[PDB]
Every structure is written in C-alpha cells, then in structure tokens.
Design a protein around this ligand. Sequence first.
Ligand SMILES: *[C@@H]1O[C@H](CO)[C@@H](O[C@@H]2O[C@H](CO)[C@@H](O)[C@H](O)[C@H]2NC(C)=O)[C@H](O)[C@H]1NC(C)=O
Ligand SMILES: *[C@@H]1O[C@H](CO)[C@@H](O[C@@H]2O[C@H](CO)[C@@H](O)[C@H](O)[C@H]2NC(C)=O)[C@H](O)[C@H]1NC(C)=O
Ligand SMILES: *[C@@H]1O[C@H](CO)[C@@H](O[C@@H]2O[C@H](CO)[C@@H](O)[C@H](O)[C@H]2NC(C)=O)[C@H](O)[C@H]1NC(C)=O
Ligand SMILES: *[C@@H]1O[C@H](CO)[C@@H](O)[C@H](O)[C@H]1NC(C)=O
Ligand SMILES: *[C@@H]1O[C@H](CO)[C@@H](O)[C@H](O)[C@H]1NC(C)=O
Ligand SMILES: *[C@@H]1O[C@H](CO)[C@@H](O)[C@H](O)[C@H]1NC(C)=O
Ligand SMILES: *[C@@H]1O[C@H](CO)[C@@H](O)[C@H](O)[C@H]1NC(C)=O
Lengths: 22, 262, 365, 48
Amino acid sequence: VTKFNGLTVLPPLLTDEMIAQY
Amino acid sequence: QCVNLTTRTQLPPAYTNSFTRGVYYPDKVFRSSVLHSTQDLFLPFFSNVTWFHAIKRFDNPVLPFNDGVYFASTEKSNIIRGWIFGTTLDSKTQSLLIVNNATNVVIKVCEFQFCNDPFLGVYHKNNKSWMESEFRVYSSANNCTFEYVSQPFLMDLEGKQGNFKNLREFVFKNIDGYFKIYSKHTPINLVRDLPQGFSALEPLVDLPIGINITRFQTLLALSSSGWTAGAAAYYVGYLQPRTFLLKYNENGTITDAVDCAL
Amino acid sequence: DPLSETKCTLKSFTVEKGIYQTSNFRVQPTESIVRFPNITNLCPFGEVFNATRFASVYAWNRKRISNCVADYSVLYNSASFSTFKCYGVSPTKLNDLCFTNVYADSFVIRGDEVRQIAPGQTGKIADYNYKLPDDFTGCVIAWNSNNLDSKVGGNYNYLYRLFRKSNLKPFERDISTEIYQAGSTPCNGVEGFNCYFPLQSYGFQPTYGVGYQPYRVVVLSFELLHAPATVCGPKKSTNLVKNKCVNFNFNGLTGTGVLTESNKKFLPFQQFGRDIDDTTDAVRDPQTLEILDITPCSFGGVSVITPGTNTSNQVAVLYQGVNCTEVPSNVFQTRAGCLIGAEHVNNSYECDIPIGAGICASYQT
Amino acid sequence: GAISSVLNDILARLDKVEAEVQIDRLITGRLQSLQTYVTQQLIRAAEI
Ligand SMILES: *[C@@H]1O[C@H](CO)[C@@H](O[C@@H]2O[C@H](CO)[C@@H](O)[C@H](O)[C@H]2NC(C)=O)[C@H](O)[C@H]1NC(C)=O
Ligand SMILES: *[C@@H]1O[C@H](CO)[C@@H](O[C@@H]2O[C@H](CO)[C@@H](O)[C@H](O)[C@H]2NC(C)=O)[C@H](O)[C@H]1NC(C)=O
Ligand SMILES: *[C@@H]1O[C@H](CO)[C@@H](O[C@@H]2O[C@H](CO)[C@@H](O)[C@H](O)[C@H]2NC(C)=O)[C@H](O)[C@H]1NC(C)=O
Ligand SMILES: *[C@@H]1O[C@H](CO)[C@@H](O)[C@H](O)[C@H]1NC(C)=O
Ligand SMILES: *[C@@H]1O[C@H](CO)[C@@H](O)[C@H](O)[C@H]1NC(C)=O
Ligand SMILES: *[C@@H]1O[C@H](CO)[C@@H](O)[C@H](O)[C@H]1NC(C)=O
Ligand SMILES: *[C@@H]1O[C@H](CO)[C@@H](O)[C@H](O)[C@H]1NC(C)=O
C-alpha cells in the first residue's frame, strides 16, 4: 500500500508500532 | 529590385506525417513533477503536414496562416532565411517580415511592396567564399511601424556533407495583437524526412504587432533565372483548438504530452 | 485563558473531561514587502490625453503603453474628465496594480453616445465602428472637447459609420470605405440607388448644444497579474526579507507566507511557479532575478486538554501539527503537534485523554 | 462566476462595496464545495 487550502491530516491515536503490538 | 526567378522544375505538393511534434509551453508559468491539462491552438498529433524541399527545385508558394502555423526545417548551411506574413502582401495593408541576414536577426513591420517571388541572394563563386548580393524581398516600405535587430554575429555560410544535421522547429501564433514565436534547435542525423522523438518549443520572442495575418510565405537562400539552389527542406502544419495533457518532470521541462482528441 | 476559550466554544460554564477543539492559530506576518521592477520613468499619458488631434471613431487609434510607471491617480482626480467608468478594477486601486500592458485607444464621438462605449452596449458606436469585449478590463475616460475642436462652420474632418454588412466583433478595425450595397442590386462606382457611402461627418459647430457636441474618448484596456508586468503603479519597492512570515506583494500578486531560496531552475521566460494545487508556490523577484519558494506561514488546530471543571481549572494546549519553535518550561513536542502545559513522564498508563501518535494525557500527583 | 478565483486578486482590484458581490460568489461556491466533501466523507465513514 502506497498548504494554503487549510487542509490537515491528524495522526491516528494508535501508531503502527502499537497496532503491530496488539 | 523585383525579379521573376522562373527556372524551377514543376511538381505536385508533397506530404509527411507529424507523429508527436509541435508542442510548446502554453503559459509563462513554471510547473514540475506534475501533469497539467490545457486547451489552446496546438498541432494535432499524427497530422498530415505539407512538405517542401529545395534541390533544380525551389518551392516557395504562398500559404494560408489560419489559426496559426507550425514550421520546421531539416537543414544545412542555413538555407532558410525567414518569413513573410500578412493578408494582401501588396502595400495596401500592413505586413510582417523576419530575416536572419549576414550579421543579425532583423524584424520589420511595414506597408511593404514585396518582390512577387522574393528571396535573399548570395554570391556562390568558386572562391569558397560567400557574401550577400541581393535583398530581393521588397521594392518599398512606404510607412514603417515596428523594427528590431539583434546584437551582431558572424553566421557561417559554408559546410557540405551527405545528410541533415540541424533540425529547426518554430511555432507562430496571432491572438490579442501579439505574434508569439516559439523555437527549438536540435542535432539530427537524417537523410530525407522529419525525425521521431519529443521536445517542447520554448517561447523565443513575442512581438507587439496588432495586425491581421491570414496568409504567409518563406525566404530561402540561393542572371534573372538559371542559378543553384541550396539543399534544404521545410514542413508546414496548421494549429487547431485542441485539449492537450502535458508532463512536467523534476526539472519542470515539458517531457511528454497527449492530444486528448487523437 | 485557554479554559475560557473552551467554555466559550462549548457555551457552558462547566466543562466535562476531554480534549476540545477551539479557535485554531495562524502565525501572523512580521512585516510587509513590496517588489515591483525598478523602472523610473513615467508613461506618455500626456501624449495620449493632451494630444493635438484625436482620430475619427471609425479610424480609432491604438497606442501601446509598455516599460514605464503609470500614475492613474492624476487621471482619476482631474476635474476635466467628465466620465471615468471602470469594468474590472476600481479607479482608486489602479495605483496598487501591475499590468501586463495597456492598450490606450483614442478617438472622438458625439456626446450623446458616451453611454454607448460600455461593454455589452448596443447603438451605432457599439455595433458599427468600435466594440469593447464583454469581459473588457479597463476604464473608459471621456470629456467634451468643443472648446478646442469645434469650428463655426463645423469640423467635418471627424467621422462615424452609418452602414456595415454586419455588426463588428470586439476591437475590429476597418480602414475600408467601399460602397454599402443596401439595395438588392450590387453596384460598382461611387454612388447608386440604395447604394451608400458608409460614413457621416459631424457638424461640430459650437451653436450645437451639449449632447450634439464633440466628446473625446480614451479607452484604457489591460490584462492583469498573470504574466511579466511591463507597466505598473507608482509604489516604492522595499527590501526583500526572507525566512520570516511576511505580507508579500510581487507585481500586485499579494499574499502571505515565508520566502525561501528556491532550487527550481526556471527558464528565462518564466516568472511565477505553480503547485499541483493550481496555486503560486514560487516567484522570481522583479528587481533581482532569483527564484523564491512561497511556503505557507505555519498554522493549525488549537485543542485544549481539560481534566474537567468538577476537578480543576488547569489545562494543557495542543498546537496541532506544528513545531515547538513556532508558537511564541513544560513544552513537549509530539507527532500530534506542540503540547504546552503538560509534563512528559516515562511511566506509561492506560489511555485517558487521547492526543494522537501514541500520546495520551491525564490528571495526577 | 466571480471575475477571478484568486481571492487577493479580487480584493486588490475592486473597492469594498463592489468586491462584496464578487467575494460572495466565491464564498457561496466554496461553502458548497465543503458541504459536498463533508457529505461524501460522512457517507464514506459509514462504509469504513
Ligand atoms: C512576375 O510575373 C507575374 C505574372 O506571373 C507578374 O504579375 C502581373 O503584375 C502586373 C502588375 O505589376 C499586373 O498588371 C498583372 O495583371 C499581373 N499578372 C498576373 C497573372 O497576376 C509580375 O508583374 C511579374 N514581375 C515583374 C517584375 O514583372
Ligand atoms: C483579414 O483579411 C481578410 C482578407 O484580407 C479578411 O477576409 C475577408 O473578409 C471580407 C468581409 O467578410 C470578405 O468579403 C472576404 O471574402 C474575406 N477574404 C478572404 C480571403 O477570406 C478578414 O476579415 C480580415 N480579418 C479581420 C479580423 O479583419
Ligand atoms: C535536471 O536538469 C539537469 C541539466 O540541467 C540534469 O543534470 C545532469 O544530470 C546528469 C545525471 O545525474 C549528470 O551526469 C549531469 O552532469 C547533470 N548536469 C548538470 C549541468 O548538472 C538533471 O539530471 C535533471 N534532473 C533530473 C531529475 O532529471
Ligand atoms: C495527406 O493529406 C492529403 C490531403 O491534403 C491526403 O490526400 C493524403 O491522403 C494525406 N496523407 C495520408 C498518409 O493519408
Ligand atoms: C534594480 O536596481 C539595481 C541597481 O540599479 C540593478 O542592479 C538591477 O538590475 C535593477 N533591476 C532590474 C530589473 O533592472
Ligand atoms: C464533583 O461532582 C461530584 C458529584 O458527581 C460531587 O460529589 C463533588 O462535590 C463535585 N466537586 C466539585 C469540586 O465540583
Ligand atoms: C526518561 O528516560 C530517558 C532515558 O531513556 C531519560 O533521559 C529521561 O530523563 C527520563 N525522564 C524521566 C522524567 O524520568
């Protein structure tokens, strides 16, 4: 799997290290 | 001086197919790592372009300019000299002249009375030397309206070999009173026809003209008949209003394109 | 305080435990920049508007204005101009703008027709001798010229068109005067039955009242901000500050951002660079020909972490997606943004109030 | 249907009482462009 407009991307609460840990 | 150089073998108009050429930068805007889509006057891809070739032969007929023109020449020794543009070409009306003379590029916009079969003539003597004889292009320029001339250069008028090594490409458009020129020069190795590959024309100069152009013709290098033509060829295509998709690479140079109506 | 900014957002005097979005922050510009090309020389507006003799309207002249400074205030304020009507800029703004070119057009018409000059008009001036494009961007400037032009026997040297095979297109120019064949028969030579000369000459004698009197018209037409400006309004360029948030103005391309050295190899013909977004992301400075990246000024959400007002008034503030250097003792950088007013601890706990990127906040001793 | 999509191009060119009419076009279309996005994203979020 692969700016002036006021758009932003928020991070997930669970990072990929913690999904891998679960 | 106006002279009817009548000695030319008579033949039908030739044709060649322009697969992926005549693309140019549509705006003075930089773009990179992106695909952009535009609609303007472009040469349609795989379009049959008219073909002319000097040899015995010296084909300089007068051609329509409707919606703008793509012009190219696979040449040697700089036998192409420039272009004539207008609608009547007979001093009743305004017109445009471009010439690469023996010292600089010059541009002139006048009520010209052109020579009916116009050219620039050069002494061809067995002295391995060449210099201008004949500005056989107009009798008069009753009122002049615009002129420009470049800082000077010694052009080279000597060199002979078995195949074409220079390809020149140009686009001419009138809209909004401006005569846009786009240009390119490329190294080639071809004997008789236009090469296949891709490169966009950078805008060279824009001229503040304001006139009607509906027709045009070209000026080539060489007593009133019987003389030696250069070996050279030129191609003419007409632009059309067509949507194009363009690729701009990491450098921001136009690197590929698609004609959406092909 | 950030707690009252939550109370205001929730419209409650009491706040439940959680993280609340509140009015999002934007780094304010530190100063302003202007950069126009360093041309010194005023434009030939005297030679347009004080000219010894205008054209007839069918013979309408076009003059180029290019490579100069244009003080349109001097036009707008001059009491002499009787109409000054604008169709894509307001005249008080003209001095702030930069223009690619101006086509200054000049001619004379009868004073009653000064209403026919506007884009989309109808009537013989608009239809038969001089048409503006419907998106004309420019200003039509007109005044009565009786006091210089008019003669007791009439200056019939000034002309307008009565006949045409079709209404002309925007900015068509017609120098031809050959016979209009209004009769069904065509007709060669100088005259015939329903055959006409296409022109009529104004009887400009001062015994005619206003309306019938001559009215000099200048039309300035221009296109804006999208290409190398040749002519601009009289404003002083400032120093080019870099790496700081700023209100920039390049050639009337006004905006706000941080200006950075650009690695974009623009060719000599380019002046604006544009992102995938169809927005300007780089510009060539017009006084030194170097490229500058226009990066946006930093901004983001402001969330307040409230442990609940039944528990405490103390709060921590998350500046979402920004560094710890942009917000100006208990400052913690997180992937979620810069967190202010909470202490980082190595002791993991259960999640309580979520922040993002594995971080969570809680109220403890 | 404003004279430009660039918001500062409108505000540089036109004085306040005229610019209000152009800016209102951009506000109206932009706001509809967000309501279209948020509706599409809510419907998508229900599928996820
Ligand atoms: C070159 O030849 C053409 C004809 O091929 C000549 O054209 C004539 O020009 C005169 C005016 O100069 C006209 O009266 C004739 O009606 C034209 N004939 C045609 C068929 O168009 C041209 O004049 C010649 N050039 C010179 C220098 O004599
Ligand atoms: C450019 O010039 C051409 C010809 O000089 C003009 O086309 C002529 O237009 C008239 C009026 O409709 C017609 O009677 C002629 O038959 C046309 N001639 C040709 C060869 O088509 C054209 O209108 C001019 N362009 C402009 C913008 O004025
Ligand atoms: C951007 O354009 C430049 C040419 O102006 C390209 O630079 C050349 O790249 C090759 C391969 O790395 C080098 O061998 C040359 O020495 C480079 N020339 C110069 C003048 O630096 C460059 O490759 C282009 N960028 C990309 C990503 O294609
Ligand atoms: C080139 O165009 C001519 C008409 O001008 C046409 O007859 C000819 O068939 C075209 N060439 C090809 C390869 O079809
Ligand atoms: C701006 O002024 C300086 C000093 O005269 C000069 O070096 C520079 O070339 C000027 N810019 C332009 C666009 O000519
Ligand atoms: C908090 O709420 C509880 C009831 O849920 C109450 O017993 C307690 O006194 C409250 N304390 C404060 C400071 O509001
Ligand atoms: C957390 O652990 C690091 C070592 O990995 C240490 O440098 C840091 O001071 C510790 N912080 C606290 C609050 O104990």
